[PDB]
């Protein structure tokens, strides 16, 4: 096998990725009165690119090493202050709002890519942009947004989950912005930006930590329960898994096999979580998530660079 | 290899007269959208300067009536009020893989006929071949210790260019595939120095030698040469 058949890698990989998210993120801890929610999203965030970082480095120890990087490493600092506080700020939304809002927020970065490139690089999509992405704002609309906000969420100030929400894809957009320019200009490769962004930040989520006065503490935490010692650290070897797979499809095939692998695996995940931890979603609702995959994917397959 | 071709070898121009040179490329030199491309010229008897790089960027310092287009494999170099101080030899180079390359050059003549870092060579002048040699490159007025590459290239009779190898400041080297097996180039910074050493010469190294400084951006571009040194192999 190995061809675009069953790439059962990425597939279980980001699978298993989400369902554990899912899974210790909003997972019940304690019983009645002596419940415990999981508050601490740093520490996720900085095993996973500990995690990151050495699957990385193993990687490109095994693989070519030929390749001498030009890039700077300022310019990988400004990349990893961006990076990680959009990872960080994602997942602490979790703590407010439903795993399937946050996923579908989390997967609208056409939005404010293109509003970066109008806005300062002035890149011009007669038809690409501007006419499909009506599809996905109809679709947020639908799912996030009611008939006129009266019913569900109502149209009381919002939680400060969706503000979150909001932050995490304006930085992930930055971020975005700031790899493109940086890999235009430099000619990096992936696995020399990677592991140069995770190491970046590994060192502030470690410096932000022991700051914050957590990792001297919330080990009383992990000691009443000491399972989630083991669980976390699956969830994070889970992604790098799936960034090292995610190359094979760089090298083979070509990226749009791995884009649209992500947007039905996406998809799946959304099932998944509205079928299996029994998450409701209310009816005239999945036709929006219907609408938002259906304009990516068009996106993805008509007018895209 | 990319192997890289300049198709008019010679031309004959007015003062007031649109000049383009040519250039392709045997292989895309093209990566995520940016063109590899570098312009240099070269007056009879001077080191190369430094002159377009992206094969759209104008270098700070060059008049504004040098310009460049083109893309894929094909690129153009465009001077529309050629003038007497631009009568030089053009080269176009590649920067898309570690073997950088220049083409063999285009002759154009007029029908009718202590803050700037000093580079300096030094080496022997007359060796018989099967003996190993030694050159060495002086830096005054800055530190080798700085974000700077420092390159040494030779050119044959012939003005046939061939970039030898390159250090950089954080210690790293990279040398030419064809040559990795000959040469070797070591530092020391002590004494602000950078040396190349051959072994067992051959009559075919009879040539000039440059030591250079540069910076990479869209592709490594030799801002500074010095003054080169020959070098004339023979029994």
């Known amino acids: 096998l190995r061809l675009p058949l069953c790439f059962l890698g990425v597939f279980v990989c980001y699978f298993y990725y989400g369902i554990l998210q899912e899974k210790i993120t909003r997972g019940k801890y304690g019983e009645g009165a002596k419940q415990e929610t999981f508050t601490f999203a740093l520490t996720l965030v900085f095993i996973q690119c500990v995690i990151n970082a050495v699957f990385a480095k193993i990687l490109i120890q095994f693989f070519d090493t030929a390749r001498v990087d030009h890039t700077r490493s300022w310019l990988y600092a400004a990349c990893s202050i961006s990076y990680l506080g959009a990872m960080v700020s994602s997942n602490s939304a979790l703590q407010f709002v439903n795993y399937p809002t946050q996923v579908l927020g989390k997967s609208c970065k056409p939005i404010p890519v293109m509003l970066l490139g109008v806005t300062l690089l002035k890149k011009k999509y007669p038809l690409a942009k501007y006419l499909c992405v009506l599809l996905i704002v109809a679709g947020v609309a639908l799912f996030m947004y009611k008939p006129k906000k009266v019913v569900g969420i109502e149209e009381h100030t919002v939680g400060y989950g969706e503000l979150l929400l909001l932050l995490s894809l304006t930085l992930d957009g930055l971020t975005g912005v700031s790899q493109d320019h940086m890999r235009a200009h430099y000619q990096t490769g992936s696995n020399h930006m990677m592991l140069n962004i995770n190491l970046w930040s590994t060192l502030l989520l470690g410096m932000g930590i022991l700051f914050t006065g957590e990792l001297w503490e919330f080990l009383s935490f992990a000691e009443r329960y000491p399972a989630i010692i083991y669980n976390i650290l699956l969830f994070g070897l889970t992604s790098a898994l799936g960034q090292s797979f995610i190359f094979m499809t760089v090298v083979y095939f070509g990226p749009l096999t791995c884009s649209i692998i992500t947007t039905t695996r996406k998809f799946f995940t959304i099932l998944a979580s509205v079928i299996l931890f029994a998450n409701p979603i209310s009816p005239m609702q999945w036709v929006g998530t219907v609408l938002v995959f259906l304009g990516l994917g068009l996106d993805a397959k008509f007018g895209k660079g | 290899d990319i192997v890289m071709t300049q198709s008019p070898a010679s031309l004959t121009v007015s003062l007031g007269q649109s000049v383009t040179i040519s250039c392709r490329a045997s292989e895309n030199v093209e990566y995520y959208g940016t063109s590899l491309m570098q312009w240099y010229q070269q007056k009879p008897g001077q080191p190369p300067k430094f002159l377009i790089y992206?094969?759209?960027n104008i270098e700070s310092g060059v008049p504004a009536r040098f310009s460049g287009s083109g893309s894929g494999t094909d690129f153009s170099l465009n001077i529309h009020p050629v003038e007497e101080d631009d009568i030089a030899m053009y080269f176009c180079?590649?920067?898309?893989?570690?073997?950088?390359?220049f083409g063999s050059g285009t002759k154009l003549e007029i029908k009718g006929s202590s803050g700037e870092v000093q580079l300096q060579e030094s080496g022997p002048g007359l060796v018989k071949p099967s003996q190993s040699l030694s050159l060495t490159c002086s830096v005054t007025?800055?530190?080798?210790?700085?974000?700077?590459?420092w390159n040494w290239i030779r050119q044959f009779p012939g003005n046939k260019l061939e970039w030898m190898a390159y250090?950089?400041?954080?210690?790293?080297?990279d040398y030419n595939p064809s040559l990795k097996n000959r040469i070797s180039i070591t530092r020391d910074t002590s004494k602000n120095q950078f040396f190349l050493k051959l072994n067992s010469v051959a009559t075919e190294d009879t040539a000039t030698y440059y030591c250079?400084?540069?910076?990479?951006?869209?592709?490594?571009?030799?801002?500074?040469w010095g003054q080169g040194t020959t070098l004339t192999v023979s029994s």
């Open positions: 992206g094969a759209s």
């Open positions: 250090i950089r400041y954080d210690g790293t080297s």
């Open positions: 180079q590649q920067s898309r893989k570690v073997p950088y390359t």
């Open positions: 250079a400084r540069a910076y990479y951006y869209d592709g490594i571009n030799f801002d500074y």
């Open positions: 007025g800055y530190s080798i210790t700085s974000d700077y590459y």
